[PDB]
Write a protein that binds this ligand. Structure first.
Ligand code: SF4
Ligand SMILES: [Zn+2]
Ligand SMILES: [Zn+2]
Lengths: 182, 434, 329
């Protein structure tokens, strides 16, 4: 239930979506960044790592934009109010809508989303894992023989690194034990 | 074997990965449940009870050979595992009991393998009096030790590193006249050393345990740790082995044939029932229904099966479309995720969903009353001795093992191959042996 | 407003400002507001005439020991303080003076078979008596109950006086041919006693009251919490279900279609909880045919009280299902 990664082609003009590292079917499977999807055109988007890099940041830097600006929405499935001026009264679940005075209020982009999505990015740029988890010997050996240079790997490494550091920067993966057992 | 063996203390205020957190949680809980099962199966000293555990335990990253101070991997894992699950069971006596009891027996086992020198020296590192005799005193005091206590036979006492004690903690080894005395520095075989260690451990451990339970509210202001806030013992397994879309493809007709040899009692009896009735209530099917995805037949094929079993029992051939079949189909749609989009696990057909009059969904071994169930199971052509030893565990209110022993008998194979947790896993096995 | 027809069971015609000039231009409806006020005060009296506020409050104050003129005005500090001090200054202490729960995750879902309502009326005075807590009897500076091996002290003694007076009422109540005067006297007296007994613990949690020795409150909360927990697990054993819990309530499943064995299960658990403690009570209050669960304080149900001959009246009940957006079709 997150939002996929859409991508603009630098030459053919078409668009793309990058869901899982491998692009589909089994023994055929190929790396995502290899060939533009549009059948005919033959440009290979990998060779534009840096450009991808840009959009990556220039995309994430709106998701965060939402959260710290987080909407507030109503719960009693009739009222359906949308505002931000957090009111001050409180109860078990939290605060209370001013109009439907018999109901709670909920965040819209629940942080769980934000962290989920950042995991979703860091997923599809870290092929190394999904490569290791693969079962069949011969498939692994043949594909690696085929097209896993240090170069391609390194480029994945680069963008994946950007993502991972940018979330682990500081929000959520930590749980400060020094306040949890006092 | 590792340094690991240690008396829990001093919460390690690091700061860590949320992923690793829930990982350790699940791992440790698995270890606990397992140890309990493995134990209640056999008796302690049997070498199955050793082999199996020393396999599993080593498999889940907790016991290897020598390494650095404390940031060696498996000891750290053990450490943070416990000092998390501490937050698990702070809300019952029965719970805190079960947790203590299990950790107790684990430590017993996991400790019973250390080399003797490592044993005594680490006891030394533990507290003060944990010190050993000189074996010369074995010769010097064989008469005293042997004739004193009945806890030793003849003269053949092995080369155990016997121990010097303060009587002040011998509080049962001596009053029962079970040891020689040298000014309260009685000398006792290792057995009672383990005993006393374990008893002081239980004491101190409970004494700590109660404290956190008296200091809960902190977590209440977070919800990342919402599962382990109070959500472990519930309707998720170890994990989803027999999940959506695993190995299987079989045509309709064969089902009944396979039934007589492959359907775990709950299912089997429900399928007999719907073979007779050809009608079921609002909730009932929603077990059997998803259970069929266990083998994973196609909807229109499953729809056809149910249609046969519906209109032959006179269910209006028009209702079917806008009624049952509708939801039966949706059972593979958008919402149902972890609610319907999954099969069921015994810990969902036990811990909840009360079965009502004359209905069939629900664990027989729980809901079926004892002796009615006795004749009932017996009707599966079962030796009454097996039935009896089964009903024993059944009133021991631990049932998975009962299902287990039943299968073990009905196929006569003298290993359960696993520790069952899901009826569909049971099924995949039953088909494996063919 | 609502009460106009719940207990009083009539109409309340009301008139906003913009019609006050209409009634300035009117003799029938102005006089009608006048006679309306007449009836207003009338119904206001009928409130007392039925609920019997006057002798109730009177007897309470009589046992309370504080100014009734400051009783109606509303207060729990008075009707606890100026009562306790009576005894506490027969015991030659010196007191200070004036200056300036657990949810159980209601498992929402419709229920078809009969549902029973367990009331923990008199839970806090019960636990306090049961475990003999009193200011003098705790090294209060995490606190722990002393050995019950001491002789019961001061406050539980007063609680016990109240409970035995309830016992007195319940005993003399079983009389026959009594004049309805003394009948109502007894019943209302019992009501008043239950009132103050439920009020009792309130004299502590109200921080701004004198006897706010909060460790007391922490301890009592801990105790009642474990009480409810044991209750849940014990009845859980019984092959039943337990949907809703709260400090002073248990909404429980029954899972049956008969009517009489129901009461047997009631009495069963009624003795079960007593196996834990004697002084602790329990009330097998009400029975529901079928029920829907949205939240505590907000749900829909069928009150089914068993009329005589094992029959039953059945009435609907919509606890809080309003429609606030006056917008629909
Ligand atoms: S293991 Fe559980 S689900 Fe399987 S037959 Fe036994 S009680 Fe039923
Ligand atoms: Zn292109
Ligand atoms: Zn509102």
């Amino acid at each position: 239930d997150c939002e996929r990664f859409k991508c603009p082609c630098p030459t053919c003009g078409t668009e793309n979506i990058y869901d899982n590292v491998f692009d589909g079917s089994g023994t055929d499977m190929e790396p995502s960044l290899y060939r533009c999807s549009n059948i005919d055109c033959k440009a290979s988007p990998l060779t534009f790592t840096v450009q991808l890099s840009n959009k990556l940041i220039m995309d994430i830097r709106r998701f965060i934009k939402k959260y710290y600006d987080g909407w507030l929405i109503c719960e009693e499935p009739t009222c359906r109010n949308r505002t931000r001026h957090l009111p001050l009264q409180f109860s078990r679940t939290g605060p209370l809508c001013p109009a439907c005075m018999k109901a709670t209020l909920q965040p819209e982009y629940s942080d769980k989303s934000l962290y989920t999505q950042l995991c979703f990015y860091r997923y599809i740029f870290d092929a190394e894992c999904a490569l290791e988890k693969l079962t069949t010997d011969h498939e692994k050996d043949k594909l690696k023989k085929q097209f896993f240079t240090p170069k391609v790997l390194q480029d994945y490494r680069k963008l994946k690194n950007t993502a991972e550091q940018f979330l682990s920067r500081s929000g959520y993966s930590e749980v400060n034990l020094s306040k949890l057992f006092a | 074997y590792p340094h690991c063996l240690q008396f829990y203390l001093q919460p390690p205020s690091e700061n860590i990965s949320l992923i690793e957190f829930e990982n350790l949680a699940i791992d440790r809980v698995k270890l606990l449940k397992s140890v309990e099962n493995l134990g209640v199966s056999y008796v302690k000293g049997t070498e199955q009870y050793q082999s199996k555990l020393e396999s599993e335990l080593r498999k889940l990253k907790f016991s290897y050979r020598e390494n650095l101070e404390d940031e060696y991997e498996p000891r750290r894992r053990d450490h943070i595992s416990h000092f998390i699950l501490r937050l698990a069971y702070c809300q019952s006596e029965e719970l805190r009991r079960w947790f203590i009891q299990q950790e107790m027996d684990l430590l017993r086992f996991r400790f019973s393998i250390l080399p003797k020198d490592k044993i005594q020296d680490f006891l030394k590192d533990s507290q003060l009096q944990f010190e050993a005799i000189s074996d010369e005193e074995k010769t010097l005091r064989e008469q005293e030790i042997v004739a004193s206590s009945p806890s030793l036979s003849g003269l053949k006492l092995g080369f155990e590193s016997i121990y010097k004690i303060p009587f002040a903690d011998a509080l049962d080894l001596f009053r029962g006249r079970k040891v020689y005395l040298e000014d309260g520095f009685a000398y006792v075989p290792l057995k009672d050393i383990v005993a006393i260690i374990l008893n002081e451990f239980r004491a101190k451990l409970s004494k700590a345990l109660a404290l956190t339970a008296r200091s809960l509210p902190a977590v209440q202001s977070d919800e990342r740790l919402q599962p382990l806030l109070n959500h472990l013992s519930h309707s998720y397994t170890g994990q989803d082995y027999s999940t959506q879309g695993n190995v299987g493809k079989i045509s309709l007709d064969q089902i009944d044939l396979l039934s007589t040899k492959s359907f775990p009692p709950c299912m089997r009896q429900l399928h007999k029932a719907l073979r007779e009735n050809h009608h079921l209530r609002h909730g009932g099917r929603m077990q059997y229904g998803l259970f069929l995805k266990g083998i994973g037949l196609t909807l229109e094929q499953a729809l056809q099966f149910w249609k046969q079993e519906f209109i032959k029992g006179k269910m209006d051939p028009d209702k079917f479309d806008k009624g049952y079949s509708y939801n039966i189909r949706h059972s593979f749609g958008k919402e149902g995720k972890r609610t319907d989009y999954t099969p069921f696990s015994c810990l969902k057909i036990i811990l909840s969903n009360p079965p009502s009059q004359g209905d069939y969904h629900g664990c027989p071994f729980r809901h079926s009353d004892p002796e009615l169930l006795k004749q009932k199971l017996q009707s599966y052509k079962i030796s009454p001795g097996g039935i009896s030893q089964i009903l024993d565990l059944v009133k021991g209110t631990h049932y998975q093992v009962a299902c287990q022993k039943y299968f073990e008998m009905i196929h006569n194979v003298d290993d359960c191959g696993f520790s069952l947790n899901h009826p569909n896993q049971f099924f995949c096995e039953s088909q494996r042996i063919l | 407003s609502e009460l106009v027809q719940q207990i009083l069971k009539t109409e309340r015609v009301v008139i906003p400002m913009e019609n006050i000039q209409n009634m300035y231009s009117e003799s029938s409806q102005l006089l009608y507001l006048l006679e309306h006020t007449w009836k207003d005060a009338k119904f206001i009296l009928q409130i007392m005439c039925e609920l019997n506020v006057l002798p109730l409050a009177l007897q309470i104050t009589n046992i309370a020991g504080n100014i009734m003129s400051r009783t109606l005005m509303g207060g729990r500090s008075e009707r606890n303080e100026f009562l306790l001090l009576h005894a506490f200054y027969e015991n030659n202490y010196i007191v200070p003076d004036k200056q300036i729960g657990l949810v159980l995750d209601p498992k929402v879902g419709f229920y078809d078979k009969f549902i029973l309502l367990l009331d923990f009326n008199s839970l806090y005075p019960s636990i306090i008596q049961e475990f003999n807590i009193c200011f003098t009897t705790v090294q209060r500076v995490i606190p722990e109950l002393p050995d019950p091996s001491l002789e019961m002290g001061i406050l539980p003694r007063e609680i016990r006086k109240l409970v035995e007076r309830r016992k007195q009422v319940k005993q003399l109540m079983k009389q026959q041919d009594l004049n309805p005067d003394l009948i109502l006297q007894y019943d209302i007296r019992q009501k008043a006693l239950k009132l103050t007994a439920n009020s009792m613990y309130g004299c502590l949690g109200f921080s701004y009251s004198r006897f706010y020795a909060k460790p007391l409150a922490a301890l009592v909360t801990y105790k009642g919490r474990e009480i409810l927990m044991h209750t849940k697990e014990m009845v859980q054993k019984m092959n039943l279900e337990v949907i809703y819990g709260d400090t002073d309530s248990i909404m429980i499943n029954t899972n049956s279609t008969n009517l009489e064995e129901v009461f047997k299960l009631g009495n069963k658990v009624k003795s079960e909880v007593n196996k834990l403690y004697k002084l602790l009570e329990i009330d097998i209050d009400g029975v529901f045919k079928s029920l829907l669960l949205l939240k505590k304080k907000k749900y829909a149900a069928l009150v089914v009280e068993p009329t005589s001959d094992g029959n039953y009246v059945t009435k609907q009940e919509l606890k809080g299902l309003d429609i606030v957006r006056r917008d629909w079709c």
